[PDB]
């Protein structure tokens, strides 16, 4: 029944690996898929998982137009957006979000053993390239930040745009591995990476504080119900278990 838009991002949404042929929703696994299964049991609904066609989370272009999963919800092309989608002020003007099912903050993914300790250290220099995922909430944060240092940084990554910004997190992580590059990535995603490559580390603390929520078109009856469901899973300690299962 319900159409759920999502995006491939480890360990939230991934293609399940099997020796036998997988069809439909079975092709996907991960934190967000366990959550979606839970939500459909609690609210009792069927669903079809579809990746967002342009592979973007969603940003508003210079002419006011949106893309990514946000656009899909806006154009009623999807009922739910269940993915590590950041709840932001700008997005709340065009779609509704459930209450957060996970919290995080923008931080820095970089290698270990350098004198770089914060965004400032990155900002006041130029040898180390740094950037974020194109059309994601992190890129938008820097693009709209009125704080000098972040404003300085947006200037840097937007000039070297075609280069500083990456298509997705996997490409950004690979850029951190094979280049002198620091990735502006969200904290729980960084936790997952550094947890698997002891050469990588989080630089500084969180630049901001926020959360991930299930997106729905504006005025959807499902939003409050999903919030109630998230609150239940939280209450019975399943959100913790799910986090531990995937981040291990
Ligand atoms: N979670 C972000 C994407 C990743 C990022 O921009 O750091 C979003 O909802 O757009």
UniProtKB/Swiss-Prot annotation:
L-glutamate binds at residues 84, 86, 91, 137-138, 186. It is found in: Cell membrane; Postsynaptic cell membrane. Glycans are attached at residue 199. The modification Phosphothreonine is found at residue 194. Residues 115-248 are extracellular. Belongs to the glutamate-gated ion channel (TC 1.A.10.1) family. GRIK1 subfamily. Ionotropic glutamate receptor that functions as a cation-permeable ligand-gated ion channel, gated by L-glutamate and the glutamatergic agonist kainic acid. L-glutamate acts as an excitatory neurotransmitter at many synapses in the central nervous system. Binding of the excitatory neurotransmitter L-glutamate induces a conformation change, leading to the opening of the cation channel, and thereby converts the chemical signal to an electrical impulse. The receptor then desensitizes rapidly and enters a transient inactive state, characterized by the presence of bound agonist. This is Glutamate receptor ionotropic, kainate 1. It comes from Rattus norvegicus (Rat). The chain holds residues 448 to 815 of 949 of the full protein.
């Amino acid at each position: 029944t319900l159409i759920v838009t999502t995006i491939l991002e480890e360990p939230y949404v991934m293609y399940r690996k099997s020796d036998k042929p997988l069809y439909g929703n079975d092709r996907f696994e991960g934190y967000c898929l366990d959550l979606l299964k839970e939500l459909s049991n609690i609210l009792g609904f069927l669903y079809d998982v579809k990746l967002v066609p342009d592979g973007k989370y969603g940003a508003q272009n210079d002419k006011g137009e949106w893309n990514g999963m946000v656009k899909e919800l806006i154009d009623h092309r999807a009922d739910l957006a269940v993915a590590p989608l950041t709840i932001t002020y700008v997005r709340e003007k065009v779609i509704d979000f459930s209450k957060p099912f996970m919290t995080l903050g923008i931080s820095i993914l970089y290698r270990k053993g350098t004198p770089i300790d914060s965004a400032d250290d990155l900002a006041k220099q130029t040898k180390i390239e740094y950037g974020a995922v194109r059309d994601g909430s992190t890129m938008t944060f820097f693009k709209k930040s009125k704080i000098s240092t972040y404003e300085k940084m947006w200037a840097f990554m937007s000039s070297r745009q075609q280069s500083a910004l990456v298509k997705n997190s996997d490409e950004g992580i690979q850029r951190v591995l094979t280049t002198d590059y620091a990735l502006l990535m969200e904290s729980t995603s960084i936790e997952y990476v550094t947890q698997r490559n002891c050469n990588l580390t989080q630089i500084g603390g969180l630049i901001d504080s926020k959360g991930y929520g299930v997106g729905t078109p504006i005025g959807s009856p499902y939003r409050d119900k999903i919030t109630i469901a998230i609150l239940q899973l939280q209450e019975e300690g399943k959100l913790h278990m799910m986090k531990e299962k995937w981040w291990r």
